[PDB]
Enzyme design. Structure first.
Site: not given
Lengths: 246, 241, 249, 246
Positions: D95, D159, D155, D147, D38, D188, D142
């Protein structure tokens, strides 16, 4: 030739379901770009009207009845094109229909969408191909739908028959490419045809902020059936202002 | 561990051999009772027997999935025997390469067998899955539904319709607690030609029927509970041609 | 008809040769005043001179699209020359096959040159196109942005980023009156390729091409003319693949 | 089950919370020795300590995935502690919505973090995976990768790059015994601020009528990194309840 490749000078074009809308703009447009057009429809009055207006405008057209799901109707059109103009170089498969249906739908309905949206145009493509080959090259244009790629409720029969039109397009391009024939599809968005509060909510996810005109589709159609698209085949072009209309 | 089908009833069609058989075997050992179906019921019965011998609950039936009587018989026979329907695996299908100028009967049969059949079963199976507080439909599609080739007019476009049917009916049967997914399997082994088959397969081996049954188990299990409308290609990273 | 660029001002980048050069010549024929750009200024100058002699309006300028000062220089120069910007064609790009273990700088460079450059130029062009009441941006991508293969980590992913960027910024600039589309060319027989290309390599490339030929630079330019004209007034967020029906591997 | 990570050593980035944490804890339970990473070390070791209690083997390290010295230190730490690397989950990213006119530094940063970092760590892991006779890489992507919306320049496009990179490097690393796959999670419900009518809106086009759980993703991660997916590679698996959460 010295004219722009954006013309169909010398071409002979069958357009199905062409009495109104997209189909009608395609017929008029193809004619003005120099094609001799066979207009077909389920009602011969509508088809003949379109043909007459083309003839009036300076072009060359005939208008015919055609239930694209009827074999003898399909064959009659092919015969009529050749009898009249002596060849077939362009096929626009614009006839189809259907819409939201519930999941529990009768099985006669599910099979109907495939009969109407798919089987008709596949057969019509078999029938035209030999003649386009003899003519030394052709283009086939399938008018599909955005439901062929989108996912939503009530779309079991419509969405899936259209997805099938998309893939048949991509695959038969392999079959008929060596015969000199290109095969593409257009997925049109919502076309403003014959209530300014509902309009703002139809266009909530449309980047260009307007509904389509039937002429937008016909412009895309003419490009795709023209020598300016000679190296384009197997493609699905979405014409919907950048998004989805609902 | 949510990768177990304990307390489940699964219909698995065209399941005599190949993919369908390995899925029938695997779901059984996963904790589920299995109504194996097939064109020829000695094939179907044999698989059912071998499951029971292994120590699992199962029955084997003749079903030509393009027969509305055969279809409804499978549903009833599932319900009498096990008390409910919770999992439906549409593995029955067929067809392959055919010339552009094929007979229309050939073209239409592609849709009858691969698409029409499995859409009916889904309709038939669904209310019972709802009545059981949820379920999973799984369609065994083909990579031809995504790929593009010569001689693929009927087989490719019908498998494409199956993929998109999967994506769309997920929206219809979602609120009924039913999940709908598909698998597109690569070339299954079920020496010189094999090197050339593997030319665009990154993992450098041909498939095993179990590979498909493993993915079938995940998707039909509660470990894929929030997975619906998906088409999973299991093909070692490429195309076998 | 709706296929003309009457009164348009087009910036065409990396346009000394091949696809860039056919687009510049064709946009000028169609009615556009053209700012031809290239890494090598004499190359851009040569295309602008041919446009001028053919009875059209053009200038040629040096431009490294990865250089912020070059980009803004180009924008200012197009405005100083023609007063407005209505069309941007992001044809400059590069890269190709690279090993998986390539240095990170190779990987980043594919994005800098293929993506960051055309994103930045779209940003710089956009408010000018809005002031002129309408625009079209066209990105020249590649089939690698869709296909999968060995040695494509940086080239393929960078072009997939171009395709998706195109789909998304269509949402952003549509309310400004700007359309954004891409072309993904297959193998195009330019004089760069046609010299290198052996008859037996060409045959392998034609194996999965239903139309039986490699593409020509003008095929791409015709598509680009359609997509930047009134004939595509209602097309945005698309990637048109011009590949003769298949792949050239 | 074939759904176990027995003898596996898994590096899991961004794993102090949310998806990364659940994947880490789940991988441990399924038999893996976990290297928890992390930005904040106290968060990484908290997950590692928790795992060690419940009966597994896990170390916790600090890692800014965009820093080469850090990347290299995780690699070395894993080899020193457990002797090999067999699994890499690239979960670290960030992001979100950005204005079109954003500074280039923001655009470029979406790529440094979402893409350049996972690609480098895959490069670093791959030789040790080959030496261990196989491995799996899992990229957490993502739905933005597929989409299309406003405000998604940096972003969404980064992805989409992740997704296509997965498809392509599957080819580079498959002859090394390494599978490379991705998960595109929907919305989520982690510990992440969400109101009742916001959540009702996201559920409007989610067929399954619930948001997702970190564990939903962890389960899919476990499948994709296990021998039960030993012939699955280059895939992008969307976990989103059957629709979109917009």
């Amino acid at each position: 030739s010295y004219e722009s490749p954006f013309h169909l000078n010398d071409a002979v074009a069958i357009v199905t379901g062409a009495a109104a809308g997209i189909g009608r703009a395609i017929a008029g447009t193809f004619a003005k770009a120099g094609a001799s057009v066979v207009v077909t429809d389920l009602k011969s009055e509508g088809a003949e009207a379109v043909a007459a207006a083309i003839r009036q405008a300076g072009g060359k057209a005939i208008g015919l009845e055609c239930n694209v799901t009827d074999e003898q109707h399909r064959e009659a059109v092919i015969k009529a094109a050749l009898d009249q103009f002596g060849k077939i170089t362009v096929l626009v498969n614009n006839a189809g229909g259907g819409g939201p249906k519930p999941f529990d739908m009768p099985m006669s309905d599910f099979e109907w969408a495939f009969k109407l949206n798919l089987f008709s145009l596949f057969r019509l493509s078999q029938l035209a191909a030999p003649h386009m080959q003899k003519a030394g090259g052709g283009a086939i244009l399938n008018i599909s739908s955005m439901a062929g790629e989108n996912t939503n409720v009530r779309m079991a029969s419509y969405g899936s028959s259209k997805a099938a039109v998309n893939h048949l397009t991509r695959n038969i391009a392999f079959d008929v490419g060596p015969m000199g024939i290109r095969v593409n599809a257009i997925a049109p968005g919502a076309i403003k045809t014959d209530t300014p509060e509902i309009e703002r909510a139809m266009l909530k996810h449309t980047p260009l902020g307007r509904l389509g005109e039937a002429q937008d589709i016909a412009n895309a159609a003419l490009f795709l059936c023209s020598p300016a698209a000679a190296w384009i085949s197997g493609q699905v072009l979405t014409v919907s202002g950048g998004g989805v209309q609902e």
